[PDB]
């Protein structure tokens, strides 16, 4: 109970920053996650033994895919950690508990294919969950792992506190379905500009947690340029595999996913930053002023993608 995790000095300091990269040493990522729960939540939120057992089962159930992998899980949790730490007082004891767990769990057992590929493949999971297919899977896998023996990290919550935190986690994971992001951000835009946004309204909180989830999920666009650029390679390695599988079903993939259309990457990054990333971090920064570094770093990387187009790299 007196066993504080500590990190080497450069990590200890850099981890507080939004643009922190968790590094290539996989064996340090569990320790980094625990460090963030202890600072974000307290050293008493979770029985350490149960937490460590939970983390290692969660890790085991991420697959060896180029992008939607255990490193993505921890990177997304670290972004949520930075948001929580820069907005100390806005979040309940329960949201702080739930949201680092949701982020760690948000892509459990991902295979590196979109909902669309499953629906066109006719994957069993598309019959069981008609919308937000993978995301209902990820939540389902989260509940499975919580119900393994010695894995209930929530065991000392009351029955209703338990139900609230599993409900925070379920909405949080559903919200990582980017198809849902657009409406969620539009509504947050109106609510904030007409002045009706009320953080005491549970349905409003829900939406603000969903936008945080999109922001943390997309945080590859908010890293220093060399991190952003090398991640883009992993992201496209999955996209191109999915395009290949689309061709195998006899379907021209969208060009984003076609590996014969690599030259169009820089212009597709512009679209994505313009239609998705910048609007996301904009609305987030309006709602949560201290998250501004995410917007500023996204705009830096947009400017780095325009330089790629101008043959300046």
Task: Mark 273-302 with x for binding to ligand K6O (rule: CB under 6 A) and - for no binding.
Answer: ---x--------------------------
221 binds, among ligand K6O, Mg ion, Zn ion, none (CB under 5 to 8 A by kind): ligand K6O
| Proportion of the chain in helix, strand, coil states, percent, rounded to 5 | 70, 0, 30
- Cβ-count burial of 154 within 10 angstroms (0-12 exposed, 13-18 middle, 19+ buried)? buried
Determine which residue in the list 23, 42, 183, 271 makes contact with ligand K6O, applying CB under 6 A: 271
Q: How is residue 146 written in tokens? A: 């919580």
Q: Is 105 an interacting residue with respect to ligand K6O (CB under 6 A)?
A: no
| Residue 119 is labelled as binding a ligand | no
| Residue 260 is labelled as binding a ligand | no
Q: How is residue 109 written in tokens? A: 């057992």
Using the minimum distance from each CB to Zn ion, give the nearer residue, 104 or 145: 104
Q: How far apart are CA 157 and CA 45, in angstroms?
A: 10
Q: In sequence order, what are the residues at sequence separation of 6 or more whose Cβ sits closer than 8 angstroms to the Cβ of residue 122?
A: none
Q: How is residue 54 written in tokens? A: 């939970």
Q: Is 304 an interacting residue with respect to ligand K6O (CB under 6 A)?
A: no
Q: Which stretch binds ligand K6O (CB under 6 A): 19-27, 43-51, 158-166, 267-275?
A: 267-275
271 binds, among Zn ion, Mg ion, ligand K6O, none (CB under 5 to 8 A by kind): ligand K6O
Q: How far apart are CA 265 and CA 249, in angstroms?
A: 24
129 binds, among Mg ion, ligand K6O, Zn ion, none (CB under 5 to 8 A by kind): none
Cα separation values, 257 from 198, 246, 260, Å: 40, 9, 9
Q: Which stretch binds ligand K6O (CB under 6 A): 129-137, 138-146, 185-193, 218-226?
A: 218-226
Q: Is 107 an interacting residue with respect to Mg ion (CB under 5 A)?
A: yes
Q: Minimum distance from CB of 43 to ligand K6O (Å)?
A: 33
Contact 106, 73 (CB under 8 A): yes
Q: In sequence order, what are the residues at sequence separation of 6 or more whose Cβ sits closer than 8 angstroms to the Cβ of residue 260?
A: none
**What residues make contact with ligand K6O under the rule CB under 6 A?**
178, 218, 220-221, 232, 235, 254, 256, 268, 271-272, 276
- Binding interface with Mg ion (CB under 5 A): 107, 176
């Amino acid at each position: 109970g007196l066993m504080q995790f500590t990190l080497p000095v450069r990590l200890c300091k850099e981890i507080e920053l939004f643009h922190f990269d968790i590094g290539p040493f996989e064996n340090m990522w569990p320790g980094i996650f625990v460090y963030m729960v202890h600072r974000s939540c307290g050293t008493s939120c979770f029985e350490l033994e149960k937490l460590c057992r939970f983390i290692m089962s969660v890790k085991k159930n991420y697959r060896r895919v180029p992008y939607h992998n255990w490193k993505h899980a921890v990177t997304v949790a670290h972004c949520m950690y930075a948001i929580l730490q820069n907005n100390h007082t806005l979040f309940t004891d329960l949201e702080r508990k739930g949201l680092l767990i949701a982020c760690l769990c948000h892509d459990l057992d991902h295979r590196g294919f979109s909902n669309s590929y499953l629906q066109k493949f006719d994957h069993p999971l598309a019959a069981l969950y008609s919308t937000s297919t993978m995301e209902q899977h990820h939540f389902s896998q989260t509940v499975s792992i919580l119900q393994l023996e010695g894995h209930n990290i929530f065991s000392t919550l009351s029955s209703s506190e338990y139900e609230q935190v599993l409900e925070i986690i379920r909405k949080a994971i559903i919200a990582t379905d980017l198809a849902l992001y657009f409406g969620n951000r539009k509504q947050l835009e109106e609510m904030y500009q007409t002045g009706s946004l009320n953080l005491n309204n549970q349905s409003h909180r829900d939406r603000v947690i969903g936008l945080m989830m999109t922001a943390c999920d997309l945080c590859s666009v908010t890293k220093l340029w060399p991190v952003t650029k090398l991640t883009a390679n992993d992201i496209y390695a999955e996209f191109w595999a999915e395009g290949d599988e689309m061709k195998k079903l006899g379907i021209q993939p969208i060009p984003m996913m076609d590996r014969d259309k690599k030259d169009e990457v820089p212009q597709g990054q512009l679209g994505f930053y313009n239609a998705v990333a910048i609007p996301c971090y904009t609305t987030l920064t309006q709602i949560l002023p201290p998250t501004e570094p995410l917007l500023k770093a996204c705009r830096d990387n947009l400017s780095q993608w325009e330089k790629v187009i101008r043959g300046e790299e």
